[PDB]
């Protein structure tokens, strides 16, 4: 699940090493959203990830319920008994998985996976560096 | 709104008509303000110009979604060529079932054959009804699909009804106590509904029966009144749909 | 009530055709009158003539209502008996006769056909003696 949330959303998350040596979140604001004031278009510095795990729980539900319907669908046509059965087995077994989308252990776990995918080193340390771009309430 | 969650759940056939919706009629998208649409959802607004074969398809799945039970919103609007839709608020005195036998319908028919001879001419009929049980009883709604004389042609014979004293007299024989104003003038320039598609927290008309009289063009005042049988071995929704001018039971008048 | 019966057919001179309407009582001259109108009626003779019928007159027996018929079921010397082929309920009325709608009888099959064809018979259950 993380390298799908990476490839949907590796526009809005970045992940770094303190010199602490603890991960840190930072993620890109867009208008439109809950925010602080005059701080749109710039990186906010995150404890957590908050909207992480909320898209998790309920953006990626669509997908799961795509496949649900996709299988559905492959299972409706006629084909072989062997075919059917093997469809009516991942099914079976599949529709288990997507309880697991919402239970807070398993989405500490995904976040701490994703935490390598989403990582992108010498950012830290280049952050703020250009002097010539000022951060200011309108952007 | 429970219940729909759970036709969606326990009914296949809901899921396929949900696919369906959801991708191949994706494309035959309609503005909200256009008329060029012929099939409706008010369930979530959505208005549809299907092409025929995307027609008959949604037909059949309703067809076999009703079979099974379920609900749905379905409508649609009549266009420049359609059939006759009717309705009557058959507000009774008494709650009680005035039972229509078939020579009562086939009296309805004969005075509404009398009453288009006087206009352009070259027959399938259906009879629905309410489920009754409900303060000023049941109504009823009569289809023609078979011909397409969508115009002023059909407020021509709305009015015609409209004075008309026999069709009255026919309700006075089963205790009726609103002999006009029952149909709406409105009846043929409204959308309609698909059967099976009931009205919100209302049951669907069922249907009664139905009659096949022969059309003749020898003779401006024959009244022939033949009856369909076995209706069951068909598509009902696909055999009454207006627009379905290919539908295997009916014809193209 | 309307009663229609067919011969197999495959013979010479054709087949004959029988229709039964028991529901009236008025076996008198009045028949014959009806006959004699018959004779010289010529929309039969039309409706058989879309049926390719080279005999419009004389198929109908001057005597059609002034000899002894037979039961259904009875059939004549070394001929088959006739089969039913359809029936009809065209409705009668007392005020405006006109009405001729033609409505399709139901529940031939689960009669007693025999009691209900007999002329005699005026306790017929489908059929009654207007």
Same mark, same amino acid.
């Given at each position: 699940?993380?390298?799908?949330?990476?490839?949907?959303?590796?526009?809005?998350?970045?992940?770094?090493?303190?010199?602490?040596?603890?991960?840190?979140?930072?993620?890109?604001?867009?208008?439109?959203?809950?925010?602080?004031?005059?701080?749109?278009?710039?990186?906010?510095?995150?404890?957590?990830?908050?909207?992480?795990?909320?898209?998790?729980?309920?953006?990626?539900?669509?997908?799961?319920? =795509?496949?649900?319907?996709? +299988?559905?669908?492959?299972?409706?046509? $006629? *084909?072989?008994?062997?075919?059917? &059965?093997?469809?009516?087995?991942?099914?079976?077994?599949?529709?288990?998985?997507?309880?697991?989308?919402?239970?807070?252990?398993?989405?500490?776990?995904?976040?701490?996976?994703?935490?390598?995918?989403? =990582?992108?080193?010498?950012? +830290?340390?280049?952050?703020?560096?250009? $002097? *010539?771009?000022?951060?200011?309430? &309108?952007? | 709104?429970?219940?729909?969650?759970?036709?969606?759940?326990?009914?296949?056939?809901?899921?396929?008509?949900?696919?369906?919706?959801?991708?191949?009629?994706?494309?035959?998208?309609?503005?909200?303000?256009?008329?060029?649409?012929?099939?409706?959802?008010?369930?979530?607004?959505?208005?549809?110009?299907?092409?025929?074969?995307?027609?008959?398809?949604?037909?059949?799945?309703?067809?076999?979604?009703?079979?099974?039970?379920?609900?749905?919103?379905?409508?649609?609007?009549?266009?420049?060529?359609?059939?006759?839709?009717?309705?009557?608020?058959?507000?009774?005195?008494?709650?009680?079932?005035?039972?229509?036998?078939?020579?009562?319908?086939?009296?309805?028919?004969?005075?509404?054959?009398?009453?288009?001879?006087?206009?352009?001419?070259?027959?399938?009929?259906?009879?629905?009804?309410?489920?009754?049980?409900?303060?000023?009883?049941?109504?009823?709604?009569?289809?023609?699909?078979?011909?397409?004389?969508?115009?002023?042609?059909?407020?021509?014979?709305?009015?015609?009804?409209?004075?008309?004293?026999?069709?009255?007299?026919?309700?006075?024989?089963?205790?009726?106590?609103?002999?006009?104003?029952?149909?709406?003038?409105?009846?043929?320039?409204?959308?309609?509904?698909?059967?099976?598609?009931?009205?919100?927290?209302?049951?669907?008309?069922?249907?009664?029966?139905?009659?096949?009289?022969?059309?003749?063009?020898?003779?401006?005042?024959?009244?022939?009144?033949?009856?369909?049988?076995?209706?069951?071995?068909?598509?009902?929704?696909?055999?009454?749909?207006?627009?379905?001018?290919?539908?295997?039971?009916?014809?193209?008048?």
């Amino acid at each position: 699940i993380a390298k799908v949330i990476y490839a949907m959303m590796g526009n809005k998350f970045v992940v770094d090493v303190d010199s602490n040596g603890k991960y840190v979140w930072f993620e890109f604001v867009l208008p439109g959203q809950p925010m602080n004031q005059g701080e749109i278009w710039k990186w906010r510095k995150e404890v957590n990830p908050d909207e992480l795990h909320i898209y998790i729980s309920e953006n990626f539900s669509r997908v799961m319920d =795509r496949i649900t319907e996709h +299988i559905k669908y492959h299972l409706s046509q $006629p *084909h072989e008994s062997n075919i059917l &059965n093997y469809y009516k087995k991942l099914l079976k077994a599949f529709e288990r998985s997507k309880s697991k989308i919402f239970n807070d252990s398993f989405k500490k776990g995904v976040i701490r996976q994703a935490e390598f995918l989403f =990582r992108q080193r010498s950012f +830290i340390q280049t952050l703020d560096t250009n $002097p *010539h771009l000022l951060g200011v309430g &309108n952007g | 709104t429970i219940q729909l969650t759970a036709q969606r759940k326990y009914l296949a056939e809901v899921q396929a008509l949900e696919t369906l919706l959801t991708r191949e009629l994706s494309v035959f998208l309609t503005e909200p303000g256009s008329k060029k649409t012929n099939i409706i959802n008010r369930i979530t607004g959505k208005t549809y110009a299907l092409p025929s074969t995307e027609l008959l398809r949604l037909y059949e799945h309703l067809e076999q979604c009703r079979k099974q039970g379920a609900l749905m919103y379905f409508l649609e609007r009549q266009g420049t060529y359609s059939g006759l839709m009717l309705d009557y608020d058959l507000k009774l005195n008494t709650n009680a079932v005035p039972p229509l036998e078939p020579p009562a319908l086939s009296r309805l028919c004969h005075r509404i054959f009398v009453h288009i001879k006087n206009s352009s001419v070259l027959i399938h009929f259906f009879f629905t009804l309410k489920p009754e049980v409900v303060q000023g009883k049941y109504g009823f709604h009569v289809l023609i699909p078979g011909l397409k004389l969508a115009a002023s042609t059909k407020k021509s014979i709305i009015g015609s009804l409209q004075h008309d004293a026999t069709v009255q007299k026919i309700l006075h024989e089963q205790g009726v106590t609103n002999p006009e104003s029952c149909l709406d003038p409105h009846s043929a320039s409204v959308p309609s509904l698909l059967y099976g598609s009931s009205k919100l927290n209302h049951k669907p008309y069922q249907l009664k029966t139905g009659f096949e009289l022969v059309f003749d063009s020898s003779d401006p005042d024959y009244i022939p009144i033949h009856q369909i049988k076995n209706l069951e071995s068909y598509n009902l929704v696909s055999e009454l749909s207006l627009t379905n001018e290919q539908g295997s039971l009916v014809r193209p008048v």
